[PDB]
Amino acid sequence: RYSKISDNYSSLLQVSEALGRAGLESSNLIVGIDFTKSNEWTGAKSFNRKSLHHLSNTPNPYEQAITIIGRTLAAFDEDNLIPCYGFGDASTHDQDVFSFYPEGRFCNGFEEVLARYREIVPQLKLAGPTSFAPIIEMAMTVVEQSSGQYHVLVIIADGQVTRSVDTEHGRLSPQEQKTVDAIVKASTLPLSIVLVGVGDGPWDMMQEFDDNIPARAFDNFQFVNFTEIMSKNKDQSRKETEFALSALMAIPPQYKATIELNLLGVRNGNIPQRIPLPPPVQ
């Protein structure tokens, strides 16, 4: 379906226009970046055995993903203020996020997101394990503090949530329990969640993930495999639009649901205030 819609789009501007015709209006963007040690090995097949956070004169998968999403959503962003967070490094493990800037100051535009990313990356100690509960809970706090403005949280990651050793007997890890609880609670807020997968994966358990989440107020989650789409036999510009559409197509019906449920523009009243740690840098 995504390939069929994207086949006629050679410009990201065309994707933006399609999102608008589907009903998207003013939208803020929140970015969360996976800084786990796993990034050092998950480019074994897809990134010539370099770390996925490797910096050079050409953008790595994190930079590429941020650029495409940033460009596509920019026209909907009425303040251009993008709060950005890291998680999975030694300062946060699976418990916290850190803000890109001290005191949690927001980035001004996706270009500053990219620039600040490049500044921070070499100074980080990569760690683990992998949970998305802290980043989703941080996004919840931002949405609530904004008085219910619509936000899209984009998480870019190179692995699934850490599993239990006894997963074969149906057991969940604490990372899974807390991440899934967070996705459920998030649907009390006007928030869309997009998980962008970069690198080798594996990702095979993500095609069923959203369908297995417990009862929610609305379907608020979408997975997209960046690396798989960008590896297809398709010209570069149309691969980029296929990625943008696959990532964001679910967003306008989610937005309309926040309006139907009357979540837009109001406060929930039951959102813990998560405090992001400072960037562990110069």
Swiss-Prot record:
Subcellular compartments:
Cell membrane; Nucleus
Q: Does the keyword Nucleotide-binding apply?
A: no
Question: What residue stretches are annotated with the VWFA domain?
Answer: 28-248
Q: What is its EC number?
A: 2.3.2.27
Keyword field: Abscisic acid signaling pathway, Cell membrane, Lipoprotein, Membrane, Metal-binding, Myristate, Nucleus, Stress response, Transferase, Ubl conjugation pathway, Zinc, Zinc-finger
> What class does this enzyme belong to in the EC scheme?
transferase
GO biological process: what's one of them? abscisic acid-activated signaling pathway
Q: Name one GO molecular function term.
A: ubiquitin-protein transferase activity
Phenotype upon loss of function? No visible phenotype; due to the redundancy with RGLG2. Rglg1 and rglg2 double mutants show a complete loss of apical dominance. The double mutant seedlings rglg1 and rglg2 exhibit a dehydration-tolerant phenotype.
Q: Spell out the reaction equation it catalyses.
A: S-ubiquitinyl-[E2 ubiquitin-conjugating enzyme]-L-cysteine + [acceptor protein]-L-lysine = [E2 ubiquitin-conjugating enzyme]-L-cysteine + N(6)-ubiquitinyl-[acceptor protein]-L-lysine
According to the UniProt record, one GO cellular component term is:
plasma membrane
How is it modified post-translationally?
N-myristoylated.
According to its record, how does it sit in the membrane?
Lipid-anchor
Q: Where are the transmembrane segments?
A: none
Q: Where is it expressed, tissue-wise? A: Ubiquitously expressed.
**Per the record's keyword annotation, is Nucleus included, yes or no?**
yes
Query: Subunit comment for this entry?
Result: Interacts with the heterodimer UBC35/UEV1B. Interacts with ERF053. Interacts with PP2CA.
Function, as annotated, reads: E3 ubiquitin-protein ligase that mediates the formation of 'Lys-63'-linked ubiquitin chains. Regulates apical dominance by acting on the auxin transport proteins abundance. Together with RGLG5, mediates the ubiquitination and subsequent proteasomal degradation of the target protein PP2CA. Functions as a positive regulator of abscisic acid (ABA) signaling through ABA-dependent degradation of PP2CA, a major inhibitor of ABA signaling. Acts as a negative regulator of drought stress response.
User: What is the name attached to this protein's record?
Assistant: E3 ubiquitin-protein ligase RGLG1
Organism of origin is Arabidopsis thaliana
